Design a protein around this ligand. Structure first.
Ligand code: K
Ligand code: K
Ligand code: K
Ligand code: K
Ligand code: K
Ligand code: K
Ligand code: K
Ligand code: K
Ligand code: K
Ligand code: K
Ligand code: K
Ligand code: K
Ligand code: K
Ligand code: K
Ligand code: K
Ligand code: MG
Ligand code: MG
Ligand code: MG
Ligand code: MG
Ligand code: MG
Ligand code: MG
Ligand code: MG
Ligand code: MG
Ligand code: MG
Ligand code: MG
Ligand code: MG
Ligand code: MG
Ligand code: MG
Ligand code: MG
Ligand code: MG
Ligand code: MG
Ligand code: MG
Ligand code: MG
Ligand code: MG
Ligand code: MG
Ligand code: MG
Ligand code: MG
Ligand code: MG
Ligand code: MG
Ligand code: MG
Ligand code: MG
Ligand code: MG
Ligand code: MG
Ligand code: MG
Ligand code: MG
Ligand code: MG
Ligand code: MG
Ligand code: MG
Ligand code: MG
Ligand code: MG
Ligand code: MG
Ligand code: MG
Ligand code: MG
Ligand code: MG
Ligand code: MG
Ligand code: MG
Ligand code: MG
Ligand code: MG
Ligand code: MG
Ligand code: MG
Ligand code: MG
Ligand code: MG
Ligand code: MG
Lengths: 184, 261, 184
RNA sequence: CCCGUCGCUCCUACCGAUUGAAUGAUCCGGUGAAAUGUUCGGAUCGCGGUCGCGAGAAGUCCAUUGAACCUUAUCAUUUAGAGGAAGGAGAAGUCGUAACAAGGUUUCCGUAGGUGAACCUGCGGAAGGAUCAUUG
RNA sequence: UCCGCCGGCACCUUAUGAGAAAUCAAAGUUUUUGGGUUCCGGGGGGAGUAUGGUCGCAAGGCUGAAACUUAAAGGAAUUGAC
RNA sequence: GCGGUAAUUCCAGCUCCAAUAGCGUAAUUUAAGUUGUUGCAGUUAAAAAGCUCGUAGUUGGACUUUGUGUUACUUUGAAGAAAUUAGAGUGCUCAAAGCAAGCCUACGCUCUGUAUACAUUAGCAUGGGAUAACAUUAUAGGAU
RNA sequence: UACCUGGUUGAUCCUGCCAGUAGUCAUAUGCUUGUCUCAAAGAUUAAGCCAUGCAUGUGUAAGUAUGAACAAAUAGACUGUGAAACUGCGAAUGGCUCAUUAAAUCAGUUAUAGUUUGUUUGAUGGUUACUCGGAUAACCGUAGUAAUUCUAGAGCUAAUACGUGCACCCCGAAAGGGAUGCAUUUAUUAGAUAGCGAUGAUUCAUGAUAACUCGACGGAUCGCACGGCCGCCGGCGACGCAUCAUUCAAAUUUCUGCCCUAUCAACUUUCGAUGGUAGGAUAGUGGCCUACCAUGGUGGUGACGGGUGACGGAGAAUUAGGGUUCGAUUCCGGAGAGGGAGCCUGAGAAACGGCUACCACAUCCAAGGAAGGCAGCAGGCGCGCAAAUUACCCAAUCCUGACACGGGGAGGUAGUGACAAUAAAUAACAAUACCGGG
RNA sequence: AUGACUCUCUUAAGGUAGCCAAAUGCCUCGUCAUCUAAUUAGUGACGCGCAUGAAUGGAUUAACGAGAUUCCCACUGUCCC
């Protein structure tokens, strides 16, 4: 026996059933370019995550509203959506969960918030800044563009202390150029 | 197999031990002793996983081999010694003394005791019968045998045992109206008042227990352990006091705690 | 060796049982003792499961026999096997098995009877002997065989298991049943 | 548009004399290792008073468990076979023209006989007919 | 001769029905799917053939494959051509 | 289906498309209401036995209180391995995961947490008695 | 995501299949491959065959030291440490594999009032002895053989080794005598009632009595500490024997449940098939076996037989629902160690990193013999479409021994690794030139 | 290679169903297979069959045979001698 055999893992996306549907290709490419995604896989996993959330809501809604499991898990699901900004305090019902869309989840990405908070000039610019260790969520540096920001953490997005854009020393390109100028 | 199994795979260990599945391929195999392997807490778990005194399997051996740990008033050096319900664990150097009691979620809790209360324990009588030479004796569910017991003591009763004199100080008859704790099954760790006893000839006897908040639950006679006569237990209970809260109620408390804390 | 398993047996329906494992040591048998009447006593110690002991008697000549009505037990010599309900061939071979009818020497019981009732079949001593003689009753059939010096007895122990041949003196309707079988 | 024989090539399967062959399993029978129990045996050793007591190997006797080998028999799987014979496939073979029109003898079903071949004929049946119709 | 009732072989009109349609007063009351029950089908061939069993005097009946082959075969209806 | 001298289909160049650190090719699920219990077909498309009888099987009219005969069914409960599945809590930088952690800055604390549901059929135990099965009834061996 | 599209015609509506579409903790293979995390890996065909190394040994203050051993000291039995060897214990767990096996294994659920159980834990063991006897290892020294943890003879000496041994009833001239611990075996007797225990239920627990057995039982053991009474008395431990309960478990066992096949309809019963009686054997129940007796037992509600490229389950894939398919493999249960069979030791094995035999393979030999079992780890050959290093370590997890310390190819670590899974680079921005829109 | 088919002479009719180197085939120890180390033998096939063939009965056939024949096992002084 190997202990590592008990480590769990799972899949995060499913490919479309119809690979060459022109309407789907047009819609997917628009989201990919709008949010600067790497490929269709990033969009597909968000859809996979959204399907899981909606599926949970549907099962709860099918139960009686007085069912203890409906009350307990229903509140937990609503609380989870609120903490990430997907829902609003005025939408505290499982029915509003079924109304969520892919755009709502893509708007909570670190890449989207960096661009829409003025820190980046373009959505694609935010992608490079995140992966280049220039952004931090609170005290922790985050280099993952897919990081889903929480409402309580959205106001703490700022440049990393070690980055040239957040008080750190200039990068090696400027430092080498300064060295070259000094030698002259 | 051709004999006795000496290993316990970690995933096969009792769930109430709360052992991480990736911590290793094996779990401590409980040694033979007063309590069953599935209803005990080995000293290695207590010293390392519960109290954090030991950081590794090796360090537990060092602590026990110094004779610094006592169970029911006697020094124990076996790492996998099966300490169980109502057992008293004493550590003179730390001046600590604990009693093994189930929390409301069915897991063993090291309930700190005062010095005065650590001089006795409660035992459930298994049976009473005549021994050799016609001498009556009774045996309990913690492996103890007591000769010349009080004639009024019968099976399923609870006896207060003094760890110093090793004699029965007092006993409680098993009857409806006493406060009992559930020591096994789904309702393990719950405390209530025995309200009814349903006997079925040739089958298990069912007992209905009502909680202090009016919640009523059933269980088998073998999973009941009387704690006191009337409504006051003879031993100190943890904070929950055997009151099982719903997940909704538990979640409500957690939400309030964050607001205050 | 000898096995007590049911694998070799046919099913209750009559179908055969295909073998799925080898013989186990915990289901073994052993050779019969075939205890015989002989003055050369021989009992061999056998080590059995759990480290316990069984005594296998190959030859025996004396036994501990009890007179039930008189509540007296005496050691006496075994003389002959006269009847066996399982197999008549065990009679001519003089095999000692449980429930076998045998003849035992009557001398040990005659001594007790004379010492107890003062009869053949000191002021205070005579006082009690006559007192016990008031309630003295002896079966005619039982008394008739005291003259020949042999008493019909039934073996109640298992010589092949305990190594001893103990029994009780036949009397009552049981004596009538067996003596009729011997009346030929 | 289309049916079958015959002729040519290839592929798959079937039948087939060879008391076919090989392989595996099982039953009965024969022989039977080893072990165990039993019987006899008493090399040898020890302990008492040149006789006793105790232990005891080789070997032997009977029985039990029973591997293994060797027959006949049965079953299973695979496989050779002169020759006989079926089906299918293979741009553009020979002979007719049976099915499609009333297909030029309406077609078809069951059954029986016959002919190079499709097919033909007898008897009863069906319309899926080429008639939903004669109180004329 | 006239009116009516039950039962039977059928026919005629009709769609509010059904169906791929022809057509059907049942072949209707079926995605608004469930009265009960038996038999039986699963692309076209190979094939009702091989083999085994069983019945028969025989003719054959009943039971009944596979290898392999093939992208159609087939049902109803429409327009042409014949 | 393309190719028989003007190839959108072959061999190439160019350009373009899909997925993308992945992608192509060679048992099984889905598609399949083409195995149909839910839920398919049998006039002509593949498919009603030539006809009737008949045992097992399967299926069986209505009626008994409304205003210690035996079972099925239903309700609730007890028991019931973990892991996996669902799911609560938790910012391993995210994630697949893991079962951790959190709190303040003392010689520490939160008794820190490590929930809960699901789990056919059979078996065990309460409540219900409509529907349904079997058994039973008039020389009452009846009740009292 | 409760979905369909191409193909039969000149065209049409159908039936119907073929093809396409998507997934697989699903294998192989092709081409390609920068980074992080995670991670399967000689199951499928051959439970085929295996060179070499390793995978099980074990020492406390507390069984046995005279190493002709070491260290430190200086008329004493020994009493600092300790190799070797005897004794004790363990090696029946773990690991590996899926061949056989279709009410069998196995699953849930029962029973043992039908049994055994080293150990742990608790309790319980009567009113020459100031300490017995004979051996043997290490050691020592004669050796044999081509040869092996192959082997013979001699001289010594220990024990917690081995063998020993202090250790109420009846008779009765009420003296005296017999029996009188515990266990073993049989018989008689009590175990009420509604002094006298328990169960749904036991002539049950247990008591008394008459005897019985040629009873591995009832301490000839060890460490530490020294005291209290005037030679006596005495502490805290270790180890060991026996009994009951308990724990760790096993064995057998109740009910229900398993894929295809009828071109398998009858099967079982001389030689056990179904049941009865009495025995034998077993830890114990039982045709488990023997003698005798009876003629039963199963079956279209599928017996019996056959097939399985069949270990069972927890589970896996896909799933609107129902369902279909898969389940060699890390958890549980079972089974096996080339094929059978037999057996010793032991609490526990029908054990195989134990033995014996046969058979099948195969190693060494001085040819007289001797030694063999990788479906443990790694590795090799073969087989194949198909699968990695003859590496390091007991630090973690836990197991085991006399044991806080030794050992552990269990297990972990690293190497190989596009089985599978997660995150995520291969550019961003500005100014020009060019090209659009508002 | 063979000749379904066609042409041609011709008979009272042109040997059909079957069967065969047969106790019936000259050629002939026919050809192929099988049995053997080796077979003019045996058996199973093939057939333009000197000269097979249907109550001058054809083709089969269980059982039977002091009938003819080939092979195998057992057995043996038949033989080695
Ligand atoms: K076992
Ligand atoms: K015609
Ligand atoms: K016609
Ligand atoms: K004709
Ligand atoms: K009418
Ligand atoms: K449906
Ligand atoms: K052992
Ligand atoms: K079970
Ligand atoms: K099963
Ligand atoms: K038995
Ligand atoms: K019997
Ligand atoms: K042992
Ligand atoms: K370790
Ligand atoms: K250790
Ligand atoms: K003749
Ligand atoms: Mg094992
Ligand atoms: Mg019970
Ligand atoms: Mg014509
Ligand atoms: Mg014509
Ligand atoms: Mg015509
Ligand atoms: Mg009409
Ligand atoms: Mg329907
Ligand atoms: Mg078909
Ligand atoms: Mg061109
Ligand atoms: Mg194309
Ligand atoms: Mg189909
Ligand atoms: Mg259909
Ligand atoms: Mg037709
Ligand atoms: Mg039809
Ligand atoms: Mg009715
Ligand atoms: Mg579907
Ligand atoms: Mg066309
Ligand atoms: Mg397909
Ligand atoms: Mg030793
Ligand atoms: Mg079978
Ligand atoms: Mg069963
Ligand atoms: Mg008794
Ligand atoms: Mg018996
Ligand atoms: Mg018999
Ligand atoms: Mg399977
Ligand atoms: Mg298999
Ligand atoms: Mg499995
Ligand atoms: Mg297999
Ligand atoms: Mg493996
Ligand atoms: Mg296993
Ligand atoms: Mg085994
Ligand atoms: Mg092998
Ligand atoms: Mg073995
Ligand atoms: Mg091995
Ligand atoms: Mg082993
Ligand atoms: Mg591979
Ligand atoms: Mg590159
Ligand atoms: Mg002819
Ligand atoms: Mg001829
Ligand atoms: Mg010839
Ligand atoms: Mg010849
Ligand atoms: Mg011939
Ligand atoms: Mg002629
Ligand atoms: Mg004629
Ligand atoms: Mg003639
Ligand atoms: Mg003939
Ligand atoms: Mg004949
Ligand atoms: Mg004749």
């Amino acid at each position: 026996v190997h202990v590592s055999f008990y480590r769990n893992y799972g899949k995060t996306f499913k490919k479309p059933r119809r690979p060459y549907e022109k309407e789907r290709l047009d819609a997917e490419l628009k989201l990919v370019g709008e949010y600067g995604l790497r490929c269709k896989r990033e969009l597909w996993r968000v859809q996979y995550a959204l399907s899981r959330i909606r599926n949970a809501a549907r099962m709860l809604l099918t139960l009686d509203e007085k069912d203890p499991r409906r009350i307990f898990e229903g509140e937990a699901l609503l609380r989870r959506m609120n903490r990430y900004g997907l829902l609003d305090e005025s939408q505290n019902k499982l029915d509003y969960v079924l109304a969520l869309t892919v755009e709502n989840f893509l708007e909570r990405r670190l890449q989207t918030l960096v661009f829409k908070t003025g820190m980046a000039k373009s959505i694609h610019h935010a992608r490079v800044l995140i992966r280049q260790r220039h952004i931090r969520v609170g005290r922790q540096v985050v280099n993952v563009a897919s990081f889903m920001v929480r409402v309580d953490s959205q106001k703490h997005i700022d440049f990393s202390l070690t980055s040239p854009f957040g008080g750190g020393r200039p990068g090696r390109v400027k430092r080498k150029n300064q060295k070259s100028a000094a030698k002259k | 197999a051709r004999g006795l199994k000496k290993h316990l795979k970690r995933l096969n260990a009792p769930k109430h031990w709360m052992l991480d599945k990736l911590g290793g391929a094996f779990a401590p195999k409980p040694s033979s002793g007063p309590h069953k392997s599935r209803e005990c807490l080995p000293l290695v778990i207590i010293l390392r996983n519960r109290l954090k005194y030991a950081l590794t399997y090796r360090e537990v051996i060092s602590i026990l081999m110094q004779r610094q740990v006592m169970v029911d008033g006697k020094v124990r050096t076996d790492k996998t010694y099966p300490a169980g319900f109502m057992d008293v664990v004493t550590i003179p150097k730390t001046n600590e003394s604990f009693r093994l009691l189930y929390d409301t979620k069915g897991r063993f809790r090291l309930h700190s005791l005062r010095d005065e209360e650590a001089k006795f324990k409660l035992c459930k009588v298994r049976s009473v019968q005549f021994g050799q030479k016609g001498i009556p004796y009774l045996n309990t569910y913690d492996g103890r045998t007591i000769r010349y017991p009080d004639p009024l003591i019968k099976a399923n009763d609870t006896i207060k045992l003094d760890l110093d004199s090793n004699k029965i100080v007092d006993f409680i008859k098993f009857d409806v109206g006493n406060v009992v704790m559930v020591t096994g099954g789904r309702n393990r760790g719950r405390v209530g008042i025995l309200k009814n006893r349903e006997k079925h000839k040739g089958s298990f006897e069912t007992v209905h227990i009502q909680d202090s908040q009016g919640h009523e639950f059933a269980t088998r006679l073998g999973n009941v352990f009387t704690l006191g006569k009337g409504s006051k237990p003879w031993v100190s209970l943890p904070k929950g006091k055997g009151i099982k809260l719903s997940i909704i109620e538990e979640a409500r408390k957690r939400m309030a705690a964050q607001s205050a804390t | 060796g000898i096995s007590r398993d049911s694998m070799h047996k046919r099913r209750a329906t009559g179908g055969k049982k295909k073998s799925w494992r080898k013989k186990r040591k915990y289901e073994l048998g052993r050779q019969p003792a075939n205890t015989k009447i002989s003055s050369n006593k021989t009992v061999r110690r056998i080590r059995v499961r759990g480290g316990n002991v069984k005594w296998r008697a190959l030859r025996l000549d004396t036994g501990n026999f009890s007179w039930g009505s008189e509540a007296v037990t005496r050691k006496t010599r075994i003389l002959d096997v006269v009847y066996n309900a399982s197999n008549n061939e065990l009679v001519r071979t003089q095999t000692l098995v449980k429930s076998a009818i045998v003849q035992v020497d009557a001398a040990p019981f005659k001594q007790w009877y004379l010492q107890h009732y003062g009869i053949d079949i000191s002021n205070h001593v005579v006082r009690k002997i006559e007192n016990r003689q008031a309630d003295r009753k002896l079966d005619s059939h039982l008394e008739e065989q005291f003259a020949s010096g042999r008493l019909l007895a039934c073996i109640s122990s298992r010589p092949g298991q305990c190594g001893r041949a103990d029994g009780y003196i036949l009397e009552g309707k049981e004596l009538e049943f067996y003596m009729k079988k011997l009346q030929k």
